[PDB]
Amino acid sequence: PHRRFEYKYSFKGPHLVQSDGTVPFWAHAGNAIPSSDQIRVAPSLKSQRGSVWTKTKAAFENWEVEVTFRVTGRGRIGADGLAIWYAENQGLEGPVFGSADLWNGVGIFFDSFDNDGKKNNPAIVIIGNNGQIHYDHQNDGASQALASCQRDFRNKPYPVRAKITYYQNTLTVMINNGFTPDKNDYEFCAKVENMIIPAQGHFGISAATGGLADDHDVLSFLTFQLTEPGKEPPTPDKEISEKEKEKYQEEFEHFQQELDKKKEEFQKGHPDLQGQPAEEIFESVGDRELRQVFEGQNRIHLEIKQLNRQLDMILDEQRRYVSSLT
Amino acid sequence: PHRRFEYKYSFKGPHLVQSDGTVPFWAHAGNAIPSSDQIRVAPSLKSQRGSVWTKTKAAFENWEVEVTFRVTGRGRIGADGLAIWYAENQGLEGPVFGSADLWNGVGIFFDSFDNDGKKNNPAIVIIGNNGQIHYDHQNDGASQALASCQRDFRNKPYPVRAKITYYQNTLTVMINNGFTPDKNDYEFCAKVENMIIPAQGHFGISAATGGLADDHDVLSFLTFQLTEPGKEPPTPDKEISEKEKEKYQEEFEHFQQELDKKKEEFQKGHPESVGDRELRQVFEGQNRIHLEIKQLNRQLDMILDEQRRYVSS
Amino acid sequence: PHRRFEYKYSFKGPHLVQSDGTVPFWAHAGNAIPSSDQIRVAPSLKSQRGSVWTKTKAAFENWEVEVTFRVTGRGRIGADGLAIWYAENQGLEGPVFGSADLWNGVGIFFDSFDNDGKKNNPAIVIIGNNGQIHYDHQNDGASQALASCQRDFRNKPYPVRAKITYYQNTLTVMINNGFTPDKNDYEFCAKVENMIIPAQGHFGISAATGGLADDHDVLSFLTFQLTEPGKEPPTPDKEISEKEKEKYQEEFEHFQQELDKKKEEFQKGHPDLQGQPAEEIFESVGDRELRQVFEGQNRIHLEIKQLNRQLDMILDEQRRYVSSLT
Amino acid sequence: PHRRFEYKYSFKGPHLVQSDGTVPFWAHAGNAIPSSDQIRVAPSLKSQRGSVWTKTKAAFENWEVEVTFRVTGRGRIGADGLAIWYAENQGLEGPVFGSADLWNGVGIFFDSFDNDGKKNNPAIVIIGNNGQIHYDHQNDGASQALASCQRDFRNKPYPVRAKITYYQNTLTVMINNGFTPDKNDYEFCAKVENMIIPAQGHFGISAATGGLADDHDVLSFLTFQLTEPGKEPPTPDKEISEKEKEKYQEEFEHFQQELDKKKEEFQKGHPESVGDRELRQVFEGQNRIHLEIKQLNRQLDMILDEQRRYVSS
Amino acid sequence: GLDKNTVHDQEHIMEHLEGVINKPEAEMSPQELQLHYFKMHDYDGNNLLDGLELSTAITHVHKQAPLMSEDELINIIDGVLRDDDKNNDGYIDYAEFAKS
Amino acid sequence: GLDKNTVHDQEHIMEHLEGVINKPEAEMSPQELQLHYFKMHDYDGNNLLDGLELSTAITHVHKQAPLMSEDELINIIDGVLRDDDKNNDGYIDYAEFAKS
Amino acid sequence: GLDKNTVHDQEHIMEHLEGVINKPEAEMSPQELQLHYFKMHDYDGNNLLDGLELSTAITHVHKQAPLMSEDELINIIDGVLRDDDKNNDGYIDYAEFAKS
Amino acid sequence: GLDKNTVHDQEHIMEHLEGVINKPEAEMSPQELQLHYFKMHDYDGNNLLDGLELSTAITHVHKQAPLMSEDELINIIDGVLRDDDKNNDGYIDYAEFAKS
Ligand SMILES: [Ca+2]
Ligand SMILES: [Ca+2]
Ligand SMILES: [Ca+2]
Ligand SMILES: [Ca+2]
Ligand SMILES: [Ca+2]
Ligand SMILES: [Ca+2]
Ligand SMILES: [Ca+2]
Ligand SMILES: [Ca+2]
Ligand SMILES: [Ca+2]
Ligand SMILES: [Ca+2]
Ligand SMILES: [Ca+2]
Ligand SMILES: [Ca+2]
Ligand SMILES: [Ca+2]
Ligand SMILES: [Ca+2]
Ligand SMILES: [Ca+2]
Ligand SMILES: [Ca+2]
Ligand SMILES: [Zn+2]
Ligand SMILES: [Zn+2]
Ligand SMILES: [Zn+2]
Ligand SMILES: [Zn+2]
């Protein structure tokens, strides 16, 4: 299909927030902390609820949503987790992942805590609702789960990417689990066929924290309107010619290469610039525990060195006392 | 010395914040997020600055503060870091660890990022200030450092504890590095002798975040007024008789035992993990080894002084 | 639907093997070790290949297969893994999970090693083949994967159960991941719709081991023929009456309760019988590593105790020498 | 003493088995699975019994065997366990740790299951036998135990090593418990003095599995003939001159350095993990602490004997 | 092939019940004897005999004799299932077992 | 401000004890429920109340109302410390709390 | 609203290029100036301006002034997309940018 | 049985060196390839050949043929140990291996 980038239902860095501290075209409520690079929907404190919703309603029958997020915890268990909504009304606050219950629309829940006790979470659950059906928070929505997909999306070296595509009444969720820096590495996660969602609704993202604590950051949110493959008006009259296209793209490329050459000699011209590595900002929880255990052994080494020095001193003192006697 | 707990200059959980969203007897400014069990002075976002200061000023000449904190990072490098201030006025905003520059008082800095490049970070740096000097941010205040120390306080399994004592015009900083859950396990870090500070000032904490990002949580802050044993004034004829105290305390203990029995019976009447317990056992064993080696060091010192006294004969 | 237990295409303990050491109605080849309780298709040595296949061909259009297995390793990575086949010919030996390539039938692969490098394994991959298509061993069959399902089935406290149902040209794979002793706890794993398989073929199980090493045990294998819900001849003439049924089931129950009462007083009559726990035969790999680390600290404690005893002895000797001088 | 490696009574990897599926100079019987890098004497199935014995008999009076093995179990309880035999004839089948009862010789048993109920398992039990006695299987041979030891050899991170030395009619068993990858790290376990064994016998290993199940892998088995330094006969006038030996060895070392350079250049020319490395570092640190404390014990013994000699004056 | 004399044999089930239940009393009733035969050969628990349990119940390893061939065993079990099983579930219940 | 009637409240300690204790008593002695009040508000677990614990005990919302000003809380807690505490440790013990 | 004088401003892009490239030479060509304007405002890398990058390129935080309202910003960006974008992809390419 | 021609073979060591070494030389000295042969067959990594390593070096399949009997291998290895080894350690060193 053909995809058009709808800016009014999207947000990205590195200028996510304006001077007023608010996300343009988006309304945030709860404990959400919008920053200049990401939105921390729910920080790593106890009982945090956050939501960011579109101010205006969307009217696309076939759409695509790309969400880049991180869920980072100090332990091996998350707290409540994330949710991506396409509702008809703004939930704001409530018990369902920091948003209100009894919604009219679709909701993709990234659950990181196993409430039911089957040890199947973290998992992605696609749940539709008409307005009167509640959500079982203590059962992870297993009875209402239209499509579940067991994917671990916590504490990954690279941001987890999710692509939710509603096309021809099919909702396809494809997830890049965040092991590689490559953006276009989407693997299949789940699919719901022949699902009816409201014709117009609000996009939204929400997160919640429970007894444990995770940082739920959303780095980007991209909304694309998808048109039909054949029902696209060409309208070639607005196009001028291929001659102007040929007169423009090559001078664009010449400008790019000339700018690269003109920047290279001054990148090394001022050597005061410093860089940072990439692997050093990732460590697994078990690896961190083992490194802490290894770090705890230095005190024993230092105390044994002190003991050895003192014992050598007393040995030399005893030898000098024997020499003094003789 | 004798310690009196001052509630007006202290905060702790598990009810740290009230319904108003403000810490009682404290004022927070910046990106600080006062929660119900800790204060996140600066979260793990880029360019975060937070401060929490006392609303009123202190009125004691010898004091002591116990600060429990965590600095948790996604990586092995840290942000700008923490600072504990005894100043003359509330800065509440500024570029020196989230607080104002050109202060008048003492500041204990917990630096996590090595701006100087001497590979001496994270570290504890005591910096005094008479009122007119600029903190060397790009050199970790090495020139202005009255004293210094070098402990790693990031990503520890247990909260890191610090005890800062101003007694007889001497400032002592002792740090429990956070490998044990014991509250009184402090180890000596730094000491400044003959330092003059203002007789009345504000107690504060602050934290700042730079290119990298750490979460700077403060779990507790307890301020004790210290008085000398010689200067301690006795106030008799106010307490009740010791027999009445014993009569009260025996039934206090009996009733608390009865309370424990009731708690157990209605916890069992009305209806940790593997690996975490194993890690706790590993750390407890390491602490036991450390304690046994410390005892061996004490015994070796004992036999050393005994041999010295025998030689002196 | 209605399910009939086909014994001739099934094996099950606790008398799995006969006196000849062979599985009845099954033929085993490779490094498979049939025991009286399970079949170790591939042991925990390097480069082991094993297969057990049905001797006779099955002729059910709609069937159900229940497989109970364990895959146990000393590390956190498996080696090659398991495979359940419904082919038309017996593969025996080959590079595809211990069985021959270019098969004509369906094959459900339980892969425990990530050959491609996407860190998506272990996973269950449903792969169909017509006879000429090869299998990409170094890419985990990702291109040919009709349905993948990311499930971790290694080192579980209870045996992993898999139910593969071919009904109305739909292959549904539902897996009990083996966290609970309950047998009927099958959660959804994968589904392939409208798949054509050969009309008659051999059932089989196979396993392989590579650079690393896992024990691949199969405790049971049950094959059920499924009939159509409505196309079932009742034939009530063979049924005698409900009166004989009522005269039989209650005396069966009376015999059961009388046997229980007659066994209870002699279960305690001879107290020489001994039992064993259940949790003690399960420990996670990380938990085992931490327990080994804790176990390694006892030597340090014993040596410190020896040091303390010797230092106390030398202190008492020094005191007695001072007393001797005086 | 002087050790001569006897190849006829030894096996090791990484080419343990040949194409015939038989261990060279050894005969295996039972459920033993001779692989190319180890011998699984008894796998983790129920009621497994395996034995691997020497085809020929030994002809030395003083000997020494180094056995490297792993006993890996799914649970914290074990099977019947391992046994290392120096017998008079190949039993190859039986109910005593997978080998025949009523043997004539010595047997070192590595018991993993406590049949007696004294909570003294897993353990190492040296049992001699003149030819006519039944091994008390349900009491771990406690009555017949010439000596005993108590080490845990199951589920260790590294292979467990055992050295059994018959020298001057004394049998010594020393065990590296498997916390370090060092080959020569043995610690004393047991010793029997003045024990008589047949002058010629078969060297064997065996393992048995009961209600529970452990994998009993044998990675290596090396048998050394020991001769006394006084009894060592010199055989001169056969070796080449020492100058020729040095001339050979200098270019041997030069050519092996050149080989290393070639290996590196065509390993880089033609194209472990985190956590595992961390665990290896943890175990190395524990071994370093143990070695340092052993050195402190040696120094304390030195100062103890020095003080004793000073007192004796 | 599941003969009437085979199920009506005291010595066989007396050998089976040794150890598990230490109550050899006297001659047992034929219905009690048949109930013991049905219960002892269901190695799982479902109160439901099947082909595998019947195969174990036919080819014993009792204390020599040649093992029965696969074809004869298959024919015997198929005949038993054809004659006794009536609901075509693949299992033999006690109501189905009591007919023969 | 820590009045005698406020400490001697059966229903308040009953409301605190819900969930942790499932033993609703009919009627308790004033000293019994006073000991319950003292044990309930020692959050740190040291049997030693201080100013912060008293501030939590006085200004908790329960089940709307304007919160008390900080100056009034300071005055109340300072008065309690001045009247009850005798060892000048800054902590309120039950020996010091037995007066009121 | 992306005026001709706005893109043809030397001081603006001179302020932007400070620090990243230390080459203030002289007055630049209008085509070079426009190319620098297009390249500096694409904060990602795709050689493709969109609505969000344009919103950042309009409401600067340069060194006071009231922030532009949401409705006026929406109207400005919608007008720019309606006039300049021709392939209806939602992005503005350099070929699409060179028209205005 | 460890003949001079068997050790001095240019292609056997080349076939062994494939995979680990990617340097096919044109022609090498007999002592050079003999040193390569000695370094290749020391699997344990101690520069000390023994009977087991020689047995691996003599009876490995390469690329069908009947395997040598154990008695012949025993005789060959015993002869090699008797002729070359001089320190009676049971190991064959290159100092002892330099004779052949
Ligand atoms: Ca949940
Ligand atoms: Ca769940
Ligand atoms: Ca710094
Ligand atoms: Ca520094
Ligand atoms: Ca694979
Ligand atoms: Ca893969
Ligand atoms: Ca035993
Ligand atoms: Ca025992
Ligand atoms: Ca059954
Ligand atoms: Ca039936
Ligand atoms: Ca308290
Ligand atoms: Ca007090
Ligand atoms: Ca762009
Ligand atoms: Ca465009
Ligand atoms: Ca060697
Ligand atoms: Ca030699
Ligand atoms: Zn029988
Ligand atoms: Zn209350
Ligand atoms: Zn600008
Ligand atoms: Zn070769």
Residue numbers in the entry:
A (entry chain E), C (entry chain A): 42 to 367
B (entry chain F), D (entry chain B): 42 to 312, 324 to 365
E (entry chain C), F (entry chain H), G (entry chain G), H (entry chain D): 40 to 102, 108 to 144
Q: What does the literature reporting this entry say, word for word?
A:
ERGIC-53 transports certain subsets of newly synthesized secretory proteins and membrane proteins from the endoplasmic reticulum to the Golgi apparatus. MCFD2 is a small protein composed of an EF-hand domain with two Ca2+ binding sites, and functions as a binding partner of ERGIC-53 in a Ca2+-dependent manner. From the amino acid sequence, ERGIC-53 is predicted to be a single-pass transmembrane protein that consists of a luminal carbohydrate recognition domain (CRD), a long stalk domain, a transmembrane (TM) helix and a short cytoplasmic tail (CT). Here we present cryo-EM structures of full-length ERGIC-53 in complex with its functional partner MCFD2. These structures reveal that ERGIC-53 exists as a homotetramer, not a homohexamer as previously suggested, and comprises a four-leaf clover-like head and a long stalk composed of three sets of four-helix coiled-coil followed by a transmembrane domain.
